[PDB]
Design a protein around this ligand. Structure first.
Ligand SMILES: *[C@@H]1O[C@H](CO)[C@@H](O[C@@H]2O[C@H](CO)[C@@H](O)[C@H](O)[C@H]2NC(C)=O)[C@H](O)[C@H]1NC(C)=O
Ligand SMILES: [Ca+2]
Lengths: 642, 183, 119, 296
């Protein structure tokens, strides 16, 4: 008896295209499918469009691709969450699912020409209006300038329509004005509950002639370092030449937000050839505190402040480095990239993330499981190493402890973290499993990636498993779904998947197989894997000295910029004097900020696997529903649990 | 004097924006390997600094893309850095330094610096007698020159100083604004 | 298979002096070099400092103008040479080469070295 | 106001032309300030004693940089003394010899600035000068607004031929020409006062002053002896339109670089073999202005 099934995303977007994935299993001949979308309770039909036909020619795996439009009914039950009923009729049989909806129309990005302004000057800013694939969109936007105490003082309403998703806007800062952190606040008309901001500072200043860089020789402080904390002061003119002068450096401990200065640390050093060194003595630091026990300082941080005066005296500038963490080890270990569920009797892969105390990946650093000797692998450029343990066929929760095993360091200096995993529960204790794996390498678009499908089920029913169904989630939508064929007897099979730019910044592979096992028991088995593409632009953009190559131009001289990028694209420019950044360098627009927003918006909450099949699908950001009554549990929360 | 550029022939650098080239283009020229190329001609401002140019692009097929920063350094061997404060109170006396720089690698320079006269400022400079020093700046070095002034008029007022080197066709001027505030 | 980059895990150089960051590969058929790129890890994450292409050589960050040179004699050698090391040069440098395959598509390989400066 | 620092700076002659500069500073909120800065600029054409500096620098609590030390007497017009501290219990005072090496006219006030390294805004700046004290440049303020008095006292000096007078009183904005008896000389510290009563208008203009009427003339204190006027006595006066002071009908005149002030001999005193020529010429000057009027 055929099982009709339907997979869609956990949350569905408005006004954008979405894909819903139709399958009939163990069916015969053409099986025609209508697919309807209504709003939930009290119905009115928002997309009846889209029907399809499931043929044996394609082994009955089709998709219908729909768009729900915005409606008056979606904006008359505000404050509470919207919902729809998604209904597929496979010829005669109907399968339906209630599915959360979000008004989140995409993203907004605000760009200000400077980071700090003075009264009387204009703020120039752009708004970039994109959808959840970062493509340009024409929508109505609400924009507010907000003063340091929280008050709107300018409002605006624009449409980025016919505008290539760029909105150029300005604001004149009045002469009498509140100094401090001002704010720009934009949101889409349809989605007022999602606000995108930027800060800029309003202050009285003049541009400095030079810049100051204050860097500790190591990106942390180790409490057992006798030498204290070495700090280098580099002072350099904004035109490129080196600086001669005097520097006052002074240290301090930070605990949460309590800043406790250490006056006895203050030094006065010469800056020669644009450079100077200075140490915070370990005696001075320990004697600057009242808790005095050296381990009570682990977790706090150290900050340094440098004032540099030129021998002319004609100009000075301040600079501070913050959050130098006090550690007992130069490394941290993270299990945020490791699935928290194993398959009893099968291997368990671990994606250990190793960071330096500031949060940056640590390249080429060994890790191993506690108790395992020999068993080690070096971490990649992205700071993730893969390890795998064999798990014993009992339902006994796995408790894994992983250490760094870095030669050069002692053992008290080695990092350690422990994690626990729960077993994927099978249907009726059947012990039927599916394990996907992938190779440990920094993946770029253009490459081919081999996805391993490993089977695990009794020989008595394995001959029925003719194919695995698999889906690729990227940026919260379904990107690709297909079938991976399998012939009886095969345990492992590889899907050769080609990574295009569509896979940035990362993606999920969910995969499943189904059968009639044991009794009249309908069984679904699924697994999923989180895979991380290397971040970069989808296209490209480069400004370079178009006038071929070299020389240093004179004030007011003409020169040619060479912009290079995607045909058709609209390019927006700004040139900022590097002096500005000496005063303020916060909230500048950055491509890795954009991805970081995108990955924060993910409808998937788990790096892989799940408690059961219905867990696997949902954690990955998907709904599964079938005519036999196999389905994912209702997702009502617009945000990932935490 | 002899072998020095006359004060009247010196044109003072004046355009000192904190920011500029707030500016839009579309890569329209037909692609070559998927890539389109625009050539932008620009006039560089007067600041002697390092411009950090930044480009963002928005594309129908490829989306939003933030370029890597590309820096341009604007530079001269000899030049003045007029170091004014942001505001000055009316009728209060202030000192201002006018630093002179020399980056010729193996040559000192005889220089005649000068504060110009302005009806809005009280200083030894008057309409019929110049306020010039004559200093020697060693190579790879700088010199401050302090000028004392008293701000008379209110609002946005202009300090300006010039310099010419002896025995070379080298010279510089600078015209900055500062803010004059009532009592 | 596709080409392979060779770059030392770390390099060390004399303060105020010169240094070389080796970046070499053995050439292969069907793999034209079309772009060389050097980045420096400005703490957070990375920033293009050098750039070689059909047009020529390109320094994309002013603190390197005059101090920076990339080998260009032996095909396979795109090593980087800094002169007059400043303490501020201490950082991670990324060598990144981009080849074209006869059909059209590009392929990328990169490697990170940690530059150290000894007083 | 010097919110956070008292600064007292004097310049006094040596017991070509060397001097003693004394810097007296202390700080408010009686726990001593930490590292502080004394930024000193020189009077145009002055330089410190290499020794006195080395002397100041070597006594601990104070630092003067090698870079400042290795500098030449040829070019050292700024200087920075670093202070390890400064409280207010007393005044921390220092002094050094400043030698003149370049004899130029006028000479510009020096200046001293104090502050702590960690706050530049909170500072104190006193200017120093031998002939002015407190270093203030000669300005001339009433109510709210000033004029630059740093300039010539009045059109300067010997032959004063008839052309030279007839010509120079038809230049740009020569707005008035009066014969005046001086009716009262109200001296003061800040600015002088000369009530001139207009004996006749030789050239009227932007001010309808009637004969017999009195008009006040201001002049800086540093001009007093150079003008050297006395009551009961008559004068000749040029002057511009840009020289007035206050609104009509109460328009005060200012004497500056562009005004001609000339002693006019009395009626009977004309007949003397020392005042012969001037009396005749000043008489000739008047008629040419009245009958003709600048034939421009
Ligand atoms: C849903 O339907 C079709 C399957 O035909 C997919 O769209 C086509 O995909 C093939 C590659 O598999 C391309 O050659 C065509 O250019 C695509 N055409 C269209 C209509 O876009 C689509 O990808 C399927 N959806 C998913 C996510 O699997
Ligand atoms: Ca990524």
């Amino acid at each position: 008896s055929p099982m009709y099934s339907i997979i869609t995303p956990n949350i569905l977007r408005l006004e954008s295209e979405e894909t819903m994935v139709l399958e009939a299993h163990d069916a015969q001949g053409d099986v025609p499918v209508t697919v309807t979308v209504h709003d939930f309770p009290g119905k009115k039909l928002v997309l009846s469009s889209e029907k399809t036909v499931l043929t044996p020619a394609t082994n009955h795996m089709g998709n219908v691709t729909f768009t729900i439009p915005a409606n008056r009914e979606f904006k008359s039950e505000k404050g509470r969450n919207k919902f729809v009923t998604v209904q597929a009729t496979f010829g005669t049989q109907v399968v339906e699912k209630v599915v959360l909806v979000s008004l989140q129309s995409g993203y907004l990005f605000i760009q200000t020409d400077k980071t700090i302004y003075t009264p009387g000057s204009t703020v120039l800013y752009r708004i970039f209006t994109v959808n959840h694939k970062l493509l340009p969109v024409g929508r109505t936007v609400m924009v507010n300038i907000e003063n340091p105490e929280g008050i709107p003082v300018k409002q605006d309403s624009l449409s980025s329509q016919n505008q290539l998703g760029v909105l150029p806007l300005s604001w004149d800062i009045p002469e009498l004005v509140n100094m401090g952190q001002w704010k720009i606040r934009a949101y889409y008309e349809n989605s007022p509950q999602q606000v995108f901001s930027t800060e800029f500072e309003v202050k009285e200043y003049v541009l400095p002639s030079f810049e100051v860089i204050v860097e500790p020789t190591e990106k942390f402080y180790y409490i057992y370092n006798e030498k204290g904390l070495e700090v280098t002061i580099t002072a350099r003119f904004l035109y490129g030449k080196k600086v001669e002068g005097t520097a006052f450096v002074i240290f301090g401990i930070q605990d949460g937000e309590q800043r406790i200065s250490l006056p006895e640390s203050l030094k006065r050093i010469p800056i020669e050839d644009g450079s100077g060194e200075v140490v915070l003595s370990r005696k001075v630091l320990l004697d600057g505190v009242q808790n005095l026990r050296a381990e009570d300082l682990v977790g706090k941080s150290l900050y340094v402040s440098a004032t540099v005066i030129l021998h002319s005296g004609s100009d000075m500038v301040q600079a501070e480095r913050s959050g130098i963490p006090i550690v007992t080890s130069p490394y941290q270990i993270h299990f945020t990239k490791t699935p928290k569920y194993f398959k009893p009797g099968m291997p368990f892969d671990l994606m250990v993330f190793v960071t330096n105390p500031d949060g940056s990946p640590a390249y080429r650093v060994p890790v191993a499981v506690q108790g395992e000797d020999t068993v080690q692998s070096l971490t990649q450029g992205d700071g993730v190493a893969k390890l795998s343990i064999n798990t014993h066929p009992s339902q006994k929760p796995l408790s894994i402890t992983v250490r760094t095993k870095k030669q050069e360091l002692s053992e008290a200096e080695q990092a350690t973290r422990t994690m626990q995993a729960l077993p994927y529960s099978t249907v009726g204790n059947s012990n039927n499993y599916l394990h996907l794996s992938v190779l440990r390498t920094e993946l770029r678009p253009g490459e081919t990636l081999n996805v391993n499908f490993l089977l695990r089920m009794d020989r008595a029913h394995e001959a029925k498993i003719r194919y695995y169904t698999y889906l690729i989630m990227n940026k919260g939508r379904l990107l690709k779904a297909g079938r991976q064929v399998r012939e009886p007897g095969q345990d492992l099979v590889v899907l050769p998947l080609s990574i295009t730019t569509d896979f940035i910044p990362s993606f999920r592979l969910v995969a499943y197989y189904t059968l009639i096992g044991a009794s009249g028991q309908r069984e679904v088995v699924a697994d999923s894997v989180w895979v991380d593409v290397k971040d970069s632009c989808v296209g490209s953009l480069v400004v370079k000295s178009g006038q071929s190559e070299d020389r240093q131009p004179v004030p007011g001289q003409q020169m040619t910029l060479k912009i290079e990028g995607d045909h058709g694209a609209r390019v927006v420019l700004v040139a900022v004097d590097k002096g500005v950044f000496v005063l303020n360098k916060k909230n500048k627009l950055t491509q890795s900020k954009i991805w970081d927003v995108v990955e924060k918006a993910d409808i998937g909450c788990t790096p892989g696997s799940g408690k059961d099949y219905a867990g696997v699908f949902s954690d990955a950001g998907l709904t599964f529903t079938s005519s036999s009554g196999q389905q994912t549990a209702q997702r009502a929360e617009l945000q990932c649990p935490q | 004097d002899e072998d020095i550029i006359a004060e009247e022939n010196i044109v003072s650098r004046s355009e000192f924006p904190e920011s500029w080239l707030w500016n839009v283009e579309d890569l329209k020229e037909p692609p070559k390997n998927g890539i389109s190329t625009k050539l932008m001609n620009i006039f560089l401002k007067d600041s002697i600094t390092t411009w950090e140019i930044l480009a963002v692009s928005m594309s129908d097929k490829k989306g939003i893309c933030v370029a890597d920063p590309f820096e341009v350094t604007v530079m001269q061997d000899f030049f003045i850095d007029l170091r004014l404060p942001y505001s000055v109170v009316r009728n209060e006396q202030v000192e201002i330094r006018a630093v002179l720089y020399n980056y010729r690698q193996n040559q000192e320079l005889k220089v005649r610096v000068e504060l110009l006269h302005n009806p809005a400022f009280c200083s030894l400079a008057t309409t019929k007698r110049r306020h010039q020093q004559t200093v020697t700046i060693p190579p790879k070095s700088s010199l401050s020159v302090p000028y004392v002034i008293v701000p008379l008029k209110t609002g946005l007022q202009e300090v300006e100083v010039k310099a010419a080197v002896y025995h070379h066709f080298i010279s510089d001027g600078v015209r900055k604004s500062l803010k004059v505030v009532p009592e | 298979g596709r080409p392979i980059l060779e770059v030392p895990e770390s390099v060390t150089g004399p303060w105020k002096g010169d240094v070389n960051l080796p970046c070499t590969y053995d050439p292969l058929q069907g793999y034209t070099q079309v772009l060389v790129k050097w980045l420096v890890q400005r703490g957070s994450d990375p920033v293009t400092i050098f750039l070689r292409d059909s047009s020529g050589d390109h320094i994309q960050q002013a603190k390197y103008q005059g101090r920076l040179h990339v080998s260009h004699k032996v095909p396979g050698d795109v090593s980087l040479q800094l002169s007059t090391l400043e303490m501020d040069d201490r950082s991670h440098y990324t060598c990144e080469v981009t080849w074209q395959t006869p059909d059209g598509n590009q392929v990328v390989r990169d490697k990170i070295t940690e530059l150290r400066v000894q007083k | 106001t010097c919110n956070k620092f008292d600064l007292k700076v004097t310049i006094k002659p040596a017991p070509k032309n060397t001097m003693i500069l004394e810097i007296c500073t202390r700080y408010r909120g009686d726990q001593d300030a930490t590292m502080s800065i004394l930024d000193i600029s020189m009077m145009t054409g002055f330089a410190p004693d290499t020794d006195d500096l080395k002397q100041l620098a070597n006594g601990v609590d104070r630092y003067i940089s090698k870079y400042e030390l290795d500098k030449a007497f040829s070019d050292r017009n700024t200087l920075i003394i670093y202070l390890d501290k400064v409280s207010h219990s007393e005044d921390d005072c220092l002094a050094f010899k400043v030698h003149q090496y370049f004899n130029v006219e006028l000479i510009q006030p020096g200046a001293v600035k104090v502050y702590a390294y960690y706050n530049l805004e909170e500072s104190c700046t006193r200017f120093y000068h031998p002939e002015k004290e407190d270093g203030k440049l000669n300005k001339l303020c009433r109510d709210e607004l000033c004029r630059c008095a740093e300039e010539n006292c009045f059109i300067q000096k010997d032959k004063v031929t008839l052309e030279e007078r007839l010509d120079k009183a038809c230049e740009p904005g020569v707005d008035y020409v009066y014969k005046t008896r001086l009716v009262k000389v109200q001296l003061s510290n800040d600015f002088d006062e000369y009530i001139m009563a207009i004996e006749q208008t030789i050239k009227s203009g932007s001010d309808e002053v009637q004969v017999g009427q009195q008009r006040t003339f201001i002049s800086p204190i540093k001009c007093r002896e150079a003008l050297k006027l006395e009551e009961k006595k008559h004068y000749l006066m040029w002057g511009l339109s840009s020289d007035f002071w206050g609104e009509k009908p109460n328009l005060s005149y200012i004497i500056g670089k562009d005004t001609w002030v000339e002693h006019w001999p009395e009626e009977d005193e004309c007949q003397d073999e020392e005042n012969q020529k001037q009396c005749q010429d000043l008489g000739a000057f008047t008629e040419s202005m009245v009958v003709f009027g600048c034939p421009n």
